[PDB]
Design an enzyme around this catalytic site. Structure first.
Site, PDB file in Angstrom:
ATOM      1  N   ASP B 222       0.847  -1.182   0.000  1.00 39.39           N
ATOM      2  CA  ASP B 222       0.000   0.000   0.000  1.00 39.39           C
ATOM      3  C   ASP B 222       0.881   1.230   0.000  1.00 39.39           C
ATOM      4  OD1 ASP B 222      -1.759   2.294   1.318  1.00 39.39           O
ATOM      5  OD2 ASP B 222      -3.152   0.744   0.634  1.00 39.39           O
ATOM      6  N   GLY B 248       4.412   1.059  -1.948  1.00 40.66           N
ATOM      7  CA  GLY B 248       4.573   1.190  -3.383  1.00 40.66           C
ATOM      8  C   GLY B 248       3.416   1.980  -3.945  1.00 40.66           C
ATOM      9  N   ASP B 249       3.571   2.385  -5.196  1.00 39.43           N
ATOM     10  CA  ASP B 249       2.524   3.126  -5.867  1.00 39.43           C
ATOM     11  C   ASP B 249       1.450   2.177  -6.379  1.00 39.43           C
ATOM     12  OD1 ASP B 249       1.540   5.723  -6.833  1.00 39.43           O
ATOM     13  OD2 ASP B 249       1.860   4.858  -8.830  1.00 39.43           O
ATOM     14  N   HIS B 268     -12.645  -1.138  -9.254  1.00 44.82           N
ATOM     15  CA  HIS B 268     -13.826  -0.339  -9.592  1.00 44.82           C
ATOM     16  C   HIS B 268     -13.593   1.163  -9.444  1.00 44.82           C
ATOM     17  CE1 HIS B 268     -16.051  -0.027  -5.376  1.00 44.82           C
ATOM     18  NE2 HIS B 268     -14.824   0.463  -5.331  1.00 44.82           N
TER      19      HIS B 268
END
Lengths: 359, 359
Positions: B222, B248-249, B268
């Protein structure tokens, strides 16, 4: 033809039981979440109304692409809004991908005889949307939000902002238009030789009364009665030769000696001090034998059954400092204005007639 | 425990049938009007949540008068709000006029394990309220409102306004808390040696997975895993010795070769181009034998049955330009990213697990 009021009471009780059954089949947090998210359904109805989707579908089912082209919206976004609405009974989706009307969606048409387009548009209007952001402070303080947000009273704001004033008035009309015929079916106005429709606006209810009671003569008492459009409307209904238009103030004493004074959605607009002022003015005009008829959504004295008045009540609290009342509260208020409550006459709709006599 | 899902599917169908019967008992304009006025029920729940009325009633029933000083609100206004809520199953009115808790009102308590307090507060928050004013143009243009209203992506606004970011996070948490146990009862995580919770936030789901699979090691991936409380939460859950925290991205390739990649409410949030980018990055990390698990509300391919995903879809449209998807839409999206849809795993809740394998 309108069903008798007792048949409507039975349908209300049945509906309430189905709704209780439904809630009980859900995890309580999930049933609560459905209520929390109801604002999103309001927004979905509002955009469908603004785009006149119901009018566009009145000639037959349309695909998302064809509908979006005719209303000027995005086909993907509009189809997703309509899918959600259709799961609530508003429009229907077909296996072939087209959308079509349902009875509930038909009532979004502007020209529906009981159209809800006006109230759908008002509930999503940016001015009224902002009003609701004042609701927590209204509950904390008991004071309407509109004077704090706008620097003036609701009526002053509506007259100063004529374009939104028409939105607001059309939103009120969506609800009010369903009330004349139930009132006429529930109460025998032919008992009256003269009726004053007190601040009755254009005279929709007075024209209904006079059409139902050929021996009755009416006074439309309203400050705006010469600008209202009342003259054109009363003539089109064929009762103009039995009507006198009297321009008077909301806080004036109306013409005296009438057999009935009819106050529809007047009393509930006002804090108790002003409501009492109006009723005492009517008390000064009425003579023995006369009747006061207050037409409002009367909230039952007890129980948790749904009632439109319980919801409209919060709207009054937010905007004008008015309220809806129970029969006992009407009795107390009337007694303080020199009246005695005789009966509450139910109708085939949510509105009732509070009947009172001078004492 | 939780029931096997067919009891839940049957209750959903029964609820839908009961709601349809209730609509059929009403004049269509009035059933429509009830939906239009949903915004008012949202505001009523919101003020009850904000005032902590549920907590105030824990020790027993209280009149509105007794509540006024307890919660700091006007006695009359609060009583009228609670009367409306009680007609919707939230609180109840006793014959003596005092209000008491109901199971739905129980879920407004802040500490309820399935508390809906966070989402009740988010739905009435003035920033979120304003965001919803952009909905008509989202439907006209298909584009999310946040860049137009606030000049940045919704998630960038959350990061730059910490106080609203927490309101939003608590509101998401209300709905998310109901998803962990249904997911664990529906899917065997014990088959995995390693699991990556991709953008798993604090690690709520990953902790549930590791507790269900004592031999499993986890990776919590995350961007904010070093700032969002994950270390404290994982330690409190007793799984920190089997979790590697990886910052992390969202658009990075995650740690490679894990037995399972779990994406809950990630796909979503994004337009198709960005969603494919994420799925292709997971595709580059996963190795033969691995599984991709996408945890989302999956909209049924046909029919107008109620489904939570149909409503959340509009929220996604408004805020981030994402969408909810049907099984066939997930199958198509997965195929373009190098996966094949294997199963859609239903749960005892609205969410499902889309299971896919790399091809």
């Amino acid at each position: 033809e309108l069903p008798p009021p007792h048949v409507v009471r039975e349908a209300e009780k049945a509906r309430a039981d189905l709704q209780r059954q439904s809630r009980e089949l859900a995890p309580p947090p999930f049933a609560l979440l459905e209520l929390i998210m109801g604002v999103m359904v309001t927004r979905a109805v509002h955009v469908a109304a603004e785009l006149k989707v119901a009018e566009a579908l009145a000639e037959g089912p349309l695909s998302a692409d064809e509908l979006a082209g005719r209303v000027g919206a995005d086909a993907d976004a509009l189809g997703r809004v309509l899918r959600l609405l259709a799961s609530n009974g508003v429009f229907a989706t077909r296996p072939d991908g087209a959308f079509e009307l349902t009875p509930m969606a038909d009532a979004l048409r502007a020209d529906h005889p009981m159209s809800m387009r006006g109230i759908a548009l008002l509930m999503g209007h940016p001015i009224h949307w902002e009003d609701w952001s004042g609701f927590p402070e209204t509950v904390v303080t008991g004071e309407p939000a509109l004077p704090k947000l706008r620097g003036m009273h609701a009526f002053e704001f509506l007259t100063k902002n004529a374009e939104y004033g028409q939105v607001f008035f059309q939103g009120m009309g969506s609800m009010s238009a369903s009330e004349t015929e139930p009132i006429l079916a529930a109460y025998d106005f032919s008992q009256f030789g003269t009726v004053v429709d007190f601040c009755g606006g254009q005279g929709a209810l007075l024209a209904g009364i006079l059409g139902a009671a050929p021996g009755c003569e009416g006074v439309l008492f309203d400050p705006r009665v010469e600008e209202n459009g009342a003259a054109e409307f009363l003539a089109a209904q064929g009762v103009a030769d039995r009507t006198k238009r009297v321009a008077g103030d909301l806080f004036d004493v109306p013409p005296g000696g009438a057999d009935a004074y009819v106050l529809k959605h007047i009393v509930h607009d006002w804090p108790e001090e002003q409501a009492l002022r109006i009723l005492r003015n009517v008390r000064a005009a009425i003579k023995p034998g006369g009747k006061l008829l207050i037409a409002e959504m009367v909230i039952p004295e007890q129980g948790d059954q749904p009632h439109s008045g319980k919801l409209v009540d919060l709207w009054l609290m937010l905007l004008v400092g008015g309220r809806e009342r129970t029969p006992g509260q009407y009795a107390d208020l009337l007694a303080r204005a020199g009246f005695r409550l005789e009966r509450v006459v139910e109708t085939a709709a949510a509105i009732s007639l509070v009947e009172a006599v001078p004492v």
